[PDB]
Design goal:
4 copies of one chain form a homotetramer. Chain A has 87 residues and is α/β, with parallel strands linked by helices. Chain A has one domain. Chain A has 2 helices and 5 strands; from the N terminus they run βββαβαβ. Chain A has a 5-stranded mixed β-sheet with strand order 4-1-2-3-5. Chains in contact: A-B, A-D, B-C, C-D. Chains A and D meet through helix 1 of A and helix 2 of D. Chains A, B, C, D: This is N-acetylmuramoyl-L-alanine amidase. It is classed as hydrolase. The entry lists the keywords lysin, hydrolase.
Chain lengths: 87, 87, 87, 87
C-alpha cells in the first residue's frame, strides 16, 4: 500500500492545515504519510515503485481529494503524518 | 501483509479489551495494528489497496474472528497495536 | 519482504544468543524481526500472507539457517529485532 | 518498495557525508534507509526479496547514483536514514 497525493499546507510555515493556501505532495507507505517537498523526491519514489512493481505508483489528484472531499484526512488518520506538524 | 478485521472495544471508553461490548474495525500493515474509526477510513484503505494490488484487501469478519475464535489476539501479538489503549 | 525463520534462544533467560540451547520462530516484515511464540501466531501470519499474495510466506528452517550457517545474524542486522533482548 | 543503493561514507569515521572517500550499500524498505555493511547482509536481502517476489531486488549502482547525480539524497529525505549518523 503506497500512494502519492496532494493536500493543503500553509505556504509560510509549512504546517498542514485543512484550509492551507498552498498544496504539497505527500507520500504514504502504509505506515506513515510524509511530505514530499521537491519534484526529484517524487521522481525517485515513482522510479523505485515502478522497478518493484512494474506499474506506476497510485496517485490521487486534487480532482479526487480536495477541500470539498478531503479524503487525505481519512488516510492520515490510519497512516499518521510524520516529520511535519499538522493543524 | 495487509488486512482489515474486527475486534472488541469498550463502547464507552474506547479501550480495546477482550470482553468489549462493541466491535471496531482495525487495520494491520504487517508492522502495527491501528483502529479504523469511521467507514470512510475503511473505504480509503480499501481503495488504496485495490489501486496497488488489483484485488480487495483481505477482511476478516466476525464469522471468522470473534470471542470464541479470537485470532486478532494472535495478530496483535505479532503486529502490536498502536495509537489506542488496550487491555 | 516477509519471512519466518528459526534462531537460537536461551531457554532460561529468554535472550537471543548465538549459542542458545533452544530455538524460536521469528517473523521479519522488512522493518524488524519479532519473536513468534505460539503456533497460532505463525498460522495467522501464514494465512494473511497467503490471502495477500497467493502463495506461502517464505520460511527458513534449521536445515538452511543454523549455528553453522547463521544467516539470521545478517537478517537481524538489516531488520533489527524488536520486543526481545539479544546478545 | 524496496531497493539497494550505494552512497558515500567516511571510511575512517563511518559517517555518511556528501563527499565521503568510500561507498557503502544501503537498504531501503519504503520506511527508512539502513546501512548494509557486509556482503552477506546484501545476499540475505536479495534472497528474501526473490523468495517473496520472484525477481531480483532493484539495485541502484554508482553508474546511476553518484556524487554527480546524488539521487540518494532524495530517497533519504523521503525514507530517512536510521541506525547511523549522517552529515
Amino acid at each position: 500500500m503506497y500512494c502519492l497525493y496532494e493536500r493543503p499546507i500553509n505556504s509560510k510555515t509549512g504546517v498542514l492545515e485543512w484550509n492551507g493556501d498552498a498544496w504539497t505532495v505527500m507520500f504514504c507507505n502504509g505506515v506513515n504519510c510524509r511530505r514530499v517537498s521537491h519534484p526529484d523526491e517524487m521522481k525517485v519514489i515513482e522510479d523505485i515503485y515502478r522497478k518493484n512493481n512494474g506499474k506506476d505508483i497510485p496517485f490521487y489528484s486534487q480532482k479526487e481529494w480536495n477541500k470539498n472531499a478531503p479524503w487525505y484526512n481519512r488516510l492520515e488518520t490510519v497512516c499518521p503524518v510524520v516529520g511535519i506538524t499538522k493543524k
